[PDB]
Write a protein that binds this ligand. Structure first.
Ligand code: BCL
Ligand code: BCL
Ligand code: BCL
Ligand code: BCL
Ligand code: BCL
Ligand code: BCL
Ligand code: BCL
Ligand code: BCL
Ligand code: BCL
Ligand SMILES: COC(C)(C)C/C=C/C(C)=C/C=C/C(C)=C/C=C/C(C)=C/C=C/C=C(C)/C=C/C=C(C)/C=C/C=C(\C)CCC=C(C)C
Lengths: 43, 55, 55, 55, 43, 55, 43, 55, 43, 55, 43, 55, 43, 55, 43, 43
């Protein structure tokens, strides 16, 4: 009877993929910031 | 209790469509990408050096 | 009467999807993040020093 | 388990309408294309050389 | 049981008209680009 | 298997309304056309030569 | 079983009025372009 | 097959409401007209000669 | 079985009020244009 | 066939709510009026003579 | 069987409050215009 | 026929929620008020005298 | 059979909290205007 | 007839979610807050003194 | 029979997480304001 | 009982076409970047 309508199992499986993709997005963003800093320092 | 297995990407990528109904979301996805292309063009086109308008 | 237990994060984070149906909200979430990226690019790109357009 | 066959385009293109209901999406598609035409006109028209207003 | 709810026959008939209209739109757009180029060359 | 016959336009144009419900889409269509008229007016009116404001 | 839900008869009747109104809109727009050209030539 | 009779306007104009449900569309129609009035005012008001702000 | 769901009677009654209100809006708009022209001529 | 009687305004004005459900439309109406007030303020406030910011 | 779904009684009661609130809004707006005119005349 | 009694405000104000479902409209109301606060801030903040940015 | 679907009791309870929160918002806004006036007078 | 008791805040704050379904409104709330952060950044970032772009 | 459709238990559990996350957001925002003030004082 | 309502087979078939179209879009975009670089170098 969840607010979303998802089962616990669905929520956990969804969360596991979300975390994986989010982590890769953040790693790529961190790399992008490193490169942009080498190209054009800020602060 | 239940612990989810670690997904393998890109092998498990098709499971996106088990969450996102492309009947609802494909056109919004394509419109979102179009908006990005318009915004990128707006920035680049605004530079006179990068636009074809030469007359 | 009923008192809720203190949640533990990030352990309990998966419970977001018991509230937010990702069928409805995943694409809007990703579009929201795209909008942020466009807006950040608009500010940074506007500085001539931080854009690749060099011709 | 089940493996999808490689689609052949443009032969399989009609299958778009098995996903996207044109009852819902045709007018939004045409409005999206109109928006593109307006935005393209805005950029090109803004150049005095490329607009008919000569008086 | 299509995602859209259309039959195969409906999708094919829809696609046939879409292609026809799209083709005429593109031909007209090509003509427009030709005329605009004659009026005001670009590049 | 099934092959669609080539449509004849404008004879078959009325079949648009077998796809697009005008109950839903007529007002959005007319609003879209209004938006175009506003945008065209914005560009043309902005030229001082093409607007009636002469005082 | 139309995608829109309209009958053939409804679609044809709708189309007949659409064409009538569209035609008058276009005639008025043509007149407007003629007058604006007399007032302020373009091209 | 079935051929539609030529409509007579403005006699047949009331048939708009057999297509467009005013329960849904009257307020959007009036808001659309308001938007036009705002946009027209924006253009005309922007001319200092045509606005009351004289102080 | 109208597309809108309105009866003929509802559509006609709705149209009668629409026409009345539209007419008064247009008369007021015409008066506004007359006054604005007296205050600040245009063209 | 049926001919509608001429309405009497403002006597018949309450019949608006037989068409427009205020459950759906009252807040949009009030938001529309707010938007007008914001736009009017934007034009008038923009004139330095008509705004309180004097420091 | 109203288009809105409201009863006559609901529409009339709604209208009565609408008129009351609208009237007070207009009186306040009139006062605001009077004060703004005293502070900074226009026209 | 039926004549409505004159409402007494603010005594009868709670009857707003008999028309407007706060389940649907409370968040839009609060977002509308937020938009007003943003717009007011935009005008006032734009004056250099009224913003904290002093460095 | 309310337009909103709320009971009288729900509407009154909702209104009571609305008034409380609105009142605190207005008091805070009044304080903010007082402070901003001390910092940078207007008018 | 019925008189509501005075609420006690923040004790009664959880009753917001008896009105506002977070399934519908949590993501819009978070997007609204994001919009505020973007707008605040737009104003502050626009001041050259308050942005990191130093090259 | 809540307006939202949530049970009391769901509303309380939701509120408990909301408060936790809100609190951390505010602490981070406070830290951000402190750092920005050290970097570039305001007022 | 998928969140989307799609079967596994539908999701896989959808994904196969998505990948094909995405790949062609990316190849075309890469070609566009190559040409634009030849026309007007950047960085
Ligand atoms: C403005 C100053 C710098 C610059 C500095 C930065 C910095 C710093 C960053 C970027 C980032 C981005 N830049 Mg940049 N960038 C510049 C100029 C450009 C130009 C241009 C026209 O010149 C373009 C087109 C771009 C485009 C991009 C995007 C590719 C990317 C933002 C993606 C996004 O929207 O995330 C938000 C949108 C979403 C999250 C929605 C979903 C998108 C997809 C689906 C993400 C899923 C992740 C998944 C795991 C990917 C798997 C694939 C492979 C592992 C790669 N940059 C200049 C040179 N750019 C960001 C980035 O790299 O992010 C990783 C970033 O941090
Ligand atoms: C800016 C520089 C040039 C200029 C260069 C170009 C170029 C180049 C093009 C245009 C095109 C267009 N220009 Mg231009 N144009 C100029 C100035 C103007 C002015 C003006 C105020 O001065 C106006 C009003 C226009 C208006 C137009 C439109 C008629 C058209 C975009 C339609 C559209 O939105 O497609 C997008 C919207 C949709 C697809 C939505 C649906 C629209 C309809 C329903 C399309 C269905 C097609 C159907 C088969 C038509 C059947 C009818 C008959 C066969 C004709 N141009 C100046 C002189 N213009 C484009 C065009 O001609 O497209 C064919 C085009 O390629
Ligand atoms: C900018 C340079 C010129 C100018 C040149 C033009 C040109 C050229 C045109 C206009 C057109 C229009 N101009 Mg102009 N116009 C100028 C300045 C103005 C000013 C002003 C404040 O100065 C205003 C208020 C307008 C207003 C208008 C509108 C009346 C009209 C666009 C309608 C529309 O939105 O169609 C799009 C919206 C819709 C289609 C939505 C539905 C609208 C209705 C319901 C249409 C149904 C048609 C129906 C059969 C009408 C029956 C009634 C009677 C037969 C009349 N113009 C200056 C002087 N103007 C256009 C026009 O006349 O169109 C016919 C047009 O071609
Ligand atoms: C810009 C140059 C001139 C000016 C020239 C004009 C001209 C010309 C016109 C206006 C019109 C309007 N002007 Mg002006 N106006 C000026 C400066 C202002 C200023 C200001 C801050 O200075 C304001 C607040 C306004 C405000 C207004 C509105 C009252 C009105 C547009 C209403 C509308 O949105 O219709 C569109 C919105 C709708 C149709 C939505 C529904 C609105 C209501 C419900 C209409 C129903 C009609 C009903 C029968 C009314 C019954 C009540 C009584 C009979 C009165 N003007 C300056 C001085 N103004 C127009 C007008 O008077 O229209 C009648 C008009 O033609
Ligand atoms: C720009 C030139 C003048 C100025 C001239 C005017 C003039 C002239 C007017 C205003 C009006 C308003 N001005 Mg001002 N105003 C100025 C500068 C400001 C500044 C500022 C940052 O300096 C602010 C915050 C405001 C704010 C306001 C609002 C309080 C009000 C518009 C409300 C609205 O949105 O109605 C539209 C929105 C709605 C109708 C939505 C619903 C709002 C509520 C629920 C209305 C219900 C009415 C109900 C009966 C109220 C009961 C409560 C008590 C009886 C009071 N002004 C300067 C000094 N201002 C207007 C006004 O006073 O309206 C009454 C008005 O006519
Ligand atoms: C621009 C000139 C002045 C300034 C003058 C003012 C004045 C005058 C005011 C503000 C107000 C606000 N200012 Mg300021 N402000 C300035 C610069 C800033 C800067 C900045 C980047 O420099 C920021 C981030 C802000 C931010 C803010 C917000 C905290 C607040 C508007 C809230 C809102 O959206 O209400 C509208 C949105 C809603 C109502 C939606 C719901 C929001 C919440 C849920 C409200 C519920 C109330 C509840 C009872 C709160 C309980 C908690 C505790 C009792 C506190 N100011 C400068 C220094 N500022 C206003 C304020 O204080 O309001 C109280 C106000 O009157
Ligand atoms: C908000 C909605 C849900 C929730 C849903 C999720 C979801 C969904 C996810 C998480 C994830 C996380 N959650 Mg959680 N989470 C919730 C509530 C919480 C609470 C809490 C106390 O309420 C906590 C402590 C956490 C904690 C966490 C983390 C363990 C993890 C995110 C790590 C990360 O992003 O780095 C912080 C990163 C940044 C702050 C951005 C960094 C960008 C940098 C700064 C780029 C700039 C560099 C450049 C050089 C600039 C120069 C230097 C500058 C001056 C800085 N969550 C609630 C219940 N949470 C994620 C996860 O587990 O991943 C494995 C994940 O996918
Ligand atoms: C403009 C002047 C200063 C600056 C001064 C400030 C100040 C002051 C603040 C920020 C804040 C932010 N700044 Mg800044 N910032 C600057 C330049 C930048 C640049 C850039 C391109 O240079 C970027 C990308 C950013 C980006 C950011 C964001 C990371 C953050 C706003 C988040 C948000 O949207 O909250 C609103 C959106 C939401 C609430 C939606 C949901 C977001 C998530 C899910 C929040 C949940 C919280 C959860 C518990 C997190 C768990 C994870 C771990 C515990 C970390 N800043 C410069 C250097 N910046 C704010 C911040 O730090 O907030 C904490 C803040 O107070
Ligand atoms: C601004 C500097 C350069 C320029 C540099 C670039 C660069 C670099 C790129 C473009 C790209 C594009 N440019 Mg450019 N471009 C310039 C000036 C223009 C002008 C103009 C008025 O001068 C126009 C109209 C365009 C138009 C375009 C589009 C055709 C294209 C973006 C499509 C899109 O929205 O993808 C986003 C939208 C979607 C994905 C939505 C769906 C669109 C369709 C359905 C995609 C499906 C793919 C499918 C497999 C196609 C099958 C058909 C055939 C195989 C071809 N350019 C100038 C000369 N341009 C991009 C491109 O080529 O993409 C491939 C690109 O990378
Ligand atoms: C049963 O069988 C079935 C189901 C019927 C089979 C049928 C299947 C069918 C028909 C299936 C069709 C499926 C179809 C058409 C797929 C189509 C897929 C495409 C075309 C993908 C494309 C994606 C592209 C992306 C993501 C792009 C991201 C860009 C991003 C983020 C940039 C961000 C940029 C910035 C911020 C920088 C801004 C800098 C500034 C402003 C200077």
């Amino acid at each position: 009877n969840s607010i979303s309508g998802l089962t616990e199992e669905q929520a956990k499986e969804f969360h596991e993929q979300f975390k994986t993709t989010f982590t890769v997005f953040m790693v790529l963003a961190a790399a992008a910031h490193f490169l942009v800093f080498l190209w054009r320092p800020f602060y | 209790e239940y612990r989810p297995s670690k997904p393998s990407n890109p092998r498990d990528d098709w499971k996106l469509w088990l969450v996102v109904n492309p009947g609802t979301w494909l056109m919004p996805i394509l419109m979102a990408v179009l908006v990005v292309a318009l915004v990128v063009h707006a920035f680049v086109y605004s530079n006179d050096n990068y636009n074809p308008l030469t007359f």
